Design a protein around this ligand. Structure first.
Ligand SMILES: CC(=O)N1CCN(c2ccc(NC(=N)N)cc2)CC1
Ligand SMILES: [Mg+2]
Length: 103
């Protein structure tokens, strides 16, 4: 239990973060040329939200794996100096620092 309440806090905080806009909804491969081919396990904050609300996280580590998948994917598809990439670095650093001051 106590693991999952910290997941709620950090996901709520990532959901309302300024730099969260690229990650709130699943990427739409129809709009994003080449995303289907490059990103084999897409992940986003609303899917983590859907899974967290339904209970589908056994431990905080599974939650963290999805979080890190958001930022691993962001770095695979977007150049570091791109507008989405810059947002993603800000979000990844945010997650990592928040996660470490809980564990
Ligand atoms: C999460 C991720 O990797 N995404 C890449 C594709 N997305 C995107 C949005 C806006 C621009 N820029 C523009 N002028 N339309 C480029 C790409 C957003 C999600
Ligand atoms: Mg990693």
């Amino acid at each position: 239990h106590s693991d999952l309440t910290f997941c709620e806090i950090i996901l709520m905080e990532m959901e309302s973060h300024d730099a969260a806009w690229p990650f709130l909804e699943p990427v739409n491969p129809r709009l994003v040329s080449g995303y289907r081919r490059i990103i084999k396990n897409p992940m986003d904050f609303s899917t983590m939200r859907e899974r967290l609300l339904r209970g589908g996280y056994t431990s905080s580590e599974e939650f963290a794996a999805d979080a890190l998948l958001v930022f691993d994917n962001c770095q695979t598809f977007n150049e570091d100096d791109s507008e989405v990439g810059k947002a993603g670095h800000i979000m990844r650093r945010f997650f990592e620092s928040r996660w470490e001051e809980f564990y």
